[PDB]
Copies of this chain bind each other. A is one copy, B any other.
Amino acid sequence: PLMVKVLDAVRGSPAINVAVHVFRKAADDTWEPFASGKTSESGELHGLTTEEEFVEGIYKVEIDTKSYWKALGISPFHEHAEVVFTANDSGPRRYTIAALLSPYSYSTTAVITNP
A residues at B contact (CB < 8 Å): 7-14, 42-43, 58, 77-80, 82-86, 92, 98, 100, 102-113
Contact = CB atoms under 8 A, between A and B. Distances in A.
A79 B113 CA distance: 19
A58 to B, nearest CB: 6
Contact of A102 (B10, B84, B85): B10
Contacts of A85: 77-79
B100 A10 contact: no
A108 B109 contact: no
B12 A110 contact: yes
A107 B103 contact: no
B12 A109 contact: yes
B110 A77 contact: yes
Contact of A104 (B10, B80, B113): B10
A41 to B, nearest CB: 8
Contacts of A42: 113
A95 to B, nearest CB: 9
Given A58-B79, A79-B86, A10 B113 contact: no
Given A79-B84, A112-B12, A107 B104 contact: no
